[PDB]
Design a protein around this ligand. Structure first.
Ligand SMILES: CC(=O)N[C@@H]1[C@@H](O)[C@H](O[C@@H]2O[C@H](CO)[C@H](O)[C@H](O)[C@H]2O)[C@@H](CO)O[C@@H]1O
Ligand SMILES: CC(=O)N[C@@H]1[C@@H](O)[C@H](O[C@@H]2O[C@H](CO)[C@H](O)[C@H](O)[C@H]2O)[C@@H](CO)O[C@@H]1O
Ligand code: CL
Lengths: 133, 132
């Protein structure tokens, strides 16, 4: 729906900075990181209003097409109709997600993927920049 | 280095790509188009490849077929360095802005109104991609 990027070969130790514009009417947006569309080490989905969630961040994994156990975050530094930046650090055991306000939290790497080769965006978000750091 | 689709780049926008050119570089390329078989722009600076030495080769690809090459003298590129290129387009041409200030045009052969595919490859490592 939004950007799909493959042929990446991000490895442990490297950082992704993603800046985007959140829609005025945003309901939800997501960032998928993984091997391919069925093997996601990280599905990051801030829900403004969707699936029954309100101002909640839902994080999950996807293994061979099937979703894992959700993990919710109540930290919610996102405003509809804004331009935000999120940074994801890929470590061996887990991922660190750094929010626009500085807040950080971790998510485990349940796949035990050694690299990130796929990135996708969806929902109510317009990718503006992707950086490798 | 990267294969991207659903880019939906439109006229009026500027695509900015910044990356580092390898120490022992032979070539690097940026492809823009519909898909891998249908490119409105293959931008390939060759430090030394296919017989070409310090030359910028540009072309199109229509249904898998390369089109007529266009060669540029300007070669504001040094190996081992970090470069940035800015591409914008319209119905008739693609404008490519290089480091030295340098800039040229390339015809919009397929007359695409939106660019959905971008690939980046060769002796170049992508540091950032922006849509301004
Ligand atoms: C509280 C609770 O259990 N809610 C869930 C939803 O989160 C879930 O929605 C799916 O969530 C996955 C992430 O795990 C993807 O975001 C997918 O897009 C969502 O639809 C649904 C269905 O799986 O189940 C409960 O409603
Ligand atoms: C002088 C000359 O005509 N040389 C050409 C090549 O440049 C060309 O190589 C391909 O060129 C396309 C651009 O047209 C891409 O850069 C592709 O990667 C290159 O292989 C070849 C092959 O089509 O034809 C002549 O040699
Ligand atoms: Cl699979």
């Amino acid at each position: 729906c939004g950007l799909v990027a493959s042929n990446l070969n991000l490895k442990p130790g490297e950082c992704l900075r993603v800046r985007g514009e959140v829609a005025a009417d945003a309901k939800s947006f997501l960032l998928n990181l993984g091997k391919d569309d069925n093997n996601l080490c990280l599905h990051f989905n801030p829900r403004f209003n969707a699936h029954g969630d309100v101002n909640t961040i839902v994080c999950n994994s996807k293994d061979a097409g099937a979703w894992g156990a959700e993990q919710r975050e109540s930290a919610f530094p996102f405003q509809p109709g804004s331009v935000v930046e999120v940074c994801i650090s890929f470590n061996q055991t887990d991922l660190t997600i750094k929010l626009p306000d500085g807040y950080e939290f971790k998510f485990p790497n349940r796949l035990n993927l050694e690299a990130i080769n796929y990135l996708s965006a969806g929902g109510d978000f317009k990718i503006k920049c992707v950086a490798f750091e």
